[PDB]
C-alpha cells in the first residue's frame, strides 16, 4: 500500500488508487504495543520499503579504483527519486499518519523509530547527491592529490558508512573541502559550486566553509592574475574581507595556506592582520 501510494505500479483512477492505498496504509497499519516494545506494522512496512529501495547500495563500496563509481549514476538517480517521493509522501500526510506527529511508552518509541527512519532518508538523499557531485568533477585528479589514509578510507567506504556513520560524514567533509580546491584550479565557477553544496547537501556542508571557499577563491585567483598590478588589490582585499568573517572558525590548515599565498604576492601587512583577527575571534573574552 505504501509503495502504491508513492506511485509504484503507476508506470503502467490513478489518483484514486493512490488515495485508496494511502487510506489502507493509515487504517490497517496497526499500532505499537508492549510485549522492549513491538512497533506497529506501519513502521515495519516503512522500514521494509526503504530497505528494498537501497538494497543494491547499502553494503556496496562507493568507488572502484582511474577511480570510478561502483553503482552507475543512472541507478543512483532513480534510487534518490524513489527515496524522495517516499519522503514527500510522509510530509504531505504528517497530520493524518499515526506516529509522525508527536504524541504512552509505546507511542513514544513509535515516534522515535519513525523519526530515525526519516532522518536516514534525508541522509540517504544527501549521501547520494554527494556521490553524484563527486563524479561530476575529476575524482582521479582529486584522488591523486590526497594522503594515503584518506585514499584507503575512500577505498573501502560503503554507502552504509556514508549514510549512517561519522567516519563517512567526516570523510565527506574532507572530500568537499578538496573538490572546491580543485574546482578553483579549473576556475570555471566558484559561486555556482557554492550554491550547489550550500543547499542540497546542507547539514553536511557548512556555511562557514563556503565563505572560506569564497576566500580561497580570490586567493588562488589572485595568484592566477598575479602578473596584473591593479586587479589583485581588489582580489586580495576582498579575500581578506571573506577571511575575517569566518575568523572565529578558520582551521589552522586553511589559515596557513592563506598566509603562504599572501607572502607570494607580497601582501605582508594584510596577512598579519588576518592572523591577529583570527586570534581575537577564537578568544573574545581574552
Amino acid at each position: 500500500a505504501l509503495a502504491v501510494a508513492c506511485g509504484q505500479g503507476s508506470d503502467l483512477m490513478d489518483r484514486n488508487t493512490e488515495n485508496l492505498a494511502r487510506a489502507a496504509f493509515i487504517e490497517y497499519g496497526g499500532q505499537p504495543r508492549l510485549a522492549s516494545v513491538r512497533l506497529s506494522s506501519r513502521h515495519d512496512a516503512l522500514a521494509l520499503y526503504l530497505t528494498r529501495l537501497v538494497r543494491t547500495l547499502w553494503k556496496a563500496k562507493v568507488v572502484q579504483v582511474d577511480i570510478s563509481s561502483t553503482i552507475p549514476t543512472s541507478k543512483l538517480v532513480t534510487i534518490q527519486e524513489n527515496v524522495e517521493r517516499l519522503r514527500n509522501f510522509l510530509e504531505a500526510n504528517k497530520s493524518t499518519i499515526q506516529g509522525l506527529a508527536p504524541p504512552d511508552i509505546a507511542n513514544q518509541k513509535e515516534h522515535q523509530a519513525l523519526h530515525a527512519l526519516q532522518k536516514l532518508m534525508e541522509s540517504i538523499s544527501e549521501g547520494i547527491s554527494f556521490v553524484l557531485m563527486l563524479f561530476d568533477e575529476r575524482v582521479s585528479d582529486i584522488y591523486a592529490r590526497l594522503d594515503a589514509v584518506s585514499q584507503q578510507q575512500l577505498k573501502d567506504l560503503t554507502y552504509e558508512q556514508l549514510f549512517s556513520q561519522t567516519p563517512g560524514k567526516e570523510l565527506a567533509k574532507v572530500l568537499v573541502k578538496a573538490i572546491v580546491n580543485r574546482n578553483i584550479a579549473s576556475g570555471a565557477n566558484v559561486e555556482t559550486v557554492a550554491d550547489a553544496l550550500r543547499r542540497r547537501c546542507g547539514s553536511f556542508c557548512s556555511p562557514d566553509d563556503v565563505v572560506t571557499f569564497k576566500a580561497q577563491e580570490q586567493l588562488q585567483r589572485a595568484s592566477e592574475q598575479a602578473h596584473n598590478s591593479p586587479v589583485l588589490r581588489a582580489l586580495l582585499a576582498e579575500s581578506l574581507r571573506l577571511f575575517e568573517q569566518v575568523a572565529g572558525s578558520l582551521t589552522p590548515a586553511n589559515l596557513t595556506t592563506a598566509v603562504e599565498q599572501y607572502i607570494s604576492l607580497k601582501y605582508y601587512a594584510g596577512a598579519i592582520q588576518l592572523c591577529l583577527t583570527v586570534a581575537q575571534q577564537k578568544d573574545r573574552g581574552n
Binding site: 576556475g187 565557477n189 566558484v190 559550486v193 557554492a194 550554491d195 602578473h227 596584473n228 591593479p230 586587479v231
Partner: protein, 215 residues
C-alpha cells in the same frame, strides 16, 4: 619652485614640443607627449589619456576651422564609434582583471579568446542559474548572456559564433544579427529593423530574460 612632480614632468614635455616647433621640426603627437608622463602616475591618469587619444584620433580636414569640424555630421559620427570602441575595450580589460587577478597574470598564460574569456567571466558573475533565463544554454551558459557580454567587449564575431551553435533555439534572430554584423555603423536596414522592433514590442516588451531584452 612652485611646480609639483607631475606638473614639472609635463613642463619638460611641453618644452620639447616647443623646441620642435621653434626649430621647424616635425609636429610630434602632443597627446603622446602628455601620456609619457601619465605612466609615471597611477593608472587613473593613464586611462584618461588613453581615452583622450582614442577620442581625438579621428580623420580630420587639416587647415579647417575648429567650429566646422565639430559641427559636421561626418566627424560627429566617428566620435561615437571611437567612444564605443573605448567602452568596449575598457570593459574587456575589466573582464580580464575579473577572471585573472592581474593584467600581467592574464598575459603570461595568454589572453584567451573573447569567447572563452566571456565564458570564464560568466562563471564568476553568475555562479548559479537565474530562473528567468530563456532560449536554453550553450556549452553551460545562457545563450543571451554570452551574446551580450561578447557585444559589450566589442567582439561581434565571438557573439555570432555563439549564435551559430544555437540556430534552432534562437529562431529568426540569426538572419537579423548576421545583418547587424555586416552593415556598418551598427545599424540595420529600415525594413528589417522594423521587423524585429515590432516583434520585440509585440510580446517581448517585458521578458524574464534581461540579457535578451538588452541585445
Amino acid at each position: 619652485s612652485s611646480l609639483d612632480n607631475i606638473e614639472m614632468a609635463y613642463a619638460r614635455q611641453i618644452y620639447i614640443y616647443n623646441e620642435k616647433i621653434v626649430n621647424g621640426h616635425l609636429q610630434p603627437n602632443l597627446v603622446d607627449l602628455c601620456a609619457s608622463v601619465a605612466e609615471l602616475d597611477d593608472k587613473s591618469i593613464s586611462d584618461m589619456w588613453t581615452m583622450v587619444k582614442q577620442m581625438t584620433d579621428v580623420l580630420l580636414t587639416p587647415a579647417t576651422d575648429a567650429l566646422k569640424n565639430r559641427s559636421s555630421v561626418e566627424v560627429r559620427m566617428e566620435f561615437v564609434r571611437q567612444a564605443l570602441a573605448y567602452l568596449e575595450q575598457s570593459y574587456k580589460n575589466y573582464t580580464l582583471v575579473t577572471v585573472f587577478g592581474n593584467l600581467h597574470q592574464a598575459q603570461l598564460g595568454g589572453v584567451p579568446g573573447t569567447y572563452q574569456l566571456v565564458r570564464s567571466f560568466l562563471n564568476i558573475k553568475l555562479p548559479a542559474p537565474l530562473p528567468g533565463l530563456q532560449d536554453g544554454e550553450v556549452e553551460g551558459h545562457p545563450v543571451w548572456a554570452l551574446i551580450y557580454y561578447c557585444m559589450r567587449c566589442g567582439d561581434l564575431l565571438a557573439a555570432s559564433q555563439v549564435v551559430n551553435r544555437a540556430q534552432h533555439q534562437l529562431g529568426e534572430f540569426k538572419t537579423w544579427f548576421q545583418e547587424y554584423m555586416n552593415s556598418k555603423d551598427r545599424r540595420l536596414s529600415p525594413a528589417t529593423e522594423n521587423k524585429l522592433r515590432l516583434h520585440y514590442r509585440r510580446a517581448l516588451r517585458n521578458n524574464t530574460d534581461p540579457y535578451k531584452r538588452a541585445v
